[PDB]
């Protein structure tokens, strides 16, 4: 989407392996606030 | 804290909680000593 009309996908009832991310090193940038990407892969939330 | 955060930052967050709850224990024990002196003075009057 355009940023003014940013798109929001709601996530529910699934198992995310957040380790699929982080990869693809050449231009990804990761910046987590409140937690890292290793510790939350063993965590759960109601809605993402 | 650990579940959603790396050690370098988790040591700081746990140290804050430790300081807070350690202050709780100091408040508790100080009041028990001050209040035990009052019941001791009463026990001395009752013995007399």
Curated annotation (Swiss-Prot), chain A:
Record annotation: effect of changing residue 29 to A: In strain: Omicron/BA.2, Omicron/BA.2.12.1, Omicron/BA.4, Omicron/BA.5, Omicron/BQ.1.1, Omicron/XBB.1.5, Omicron/EG.5.1
Q: How does it assemble?
A: Binds to host ACE2. RBD also interacts with the N-linked glycan on 'Asn-90' of ACE2. Cleavage of S generates a polybasic C-terminal sequence on S1 that binds to host Neuropilin-1 (NRP1) and Neuropilin-2 (NRP2) receptors. Interacts with host integrin alpha-5/beta-1 (ITGA5:ITGB1) and with ACE2 in complex with integrin alpha-5/beta-1 (ITGA5:ITGB1). May interact via cytoplasmic c-terminus with M protein. May interact (via N-terminus) with host bilirubin and biliverdin, thereby preventing antibody binding to the SARS-CoV-2 spike NTD via an allosteric mechanism.
Say what the protein does: Attaches the virion to the cell membrane by interacting with host receptor, initiating the infection. The major receptor is host ACE2. When S2/S2' has been cleaved, binding to the receptor triggers direct fusion at the cell membrane. When S2/S2' has not been cleaved, binding to the receptor results in internalization of the virus by endocytosis using host TFRC and GRM2 and leading to fusion of the virion membrane with the host endosomal membrane. Alternatively, may use NRP1/NRP2 and integrin as entry receptors.
List the protein's name: Spike protein S1
Q: What is the lineage of its organism?
A: Viruses, Riboviria, Orthornavirae, Pisuviricota, Pisoniviricetes
Gene that produces this protein:
S
**Where in the full protein does the shown chain start and end, and how long is the full protein?**
348 to 395 of 1273
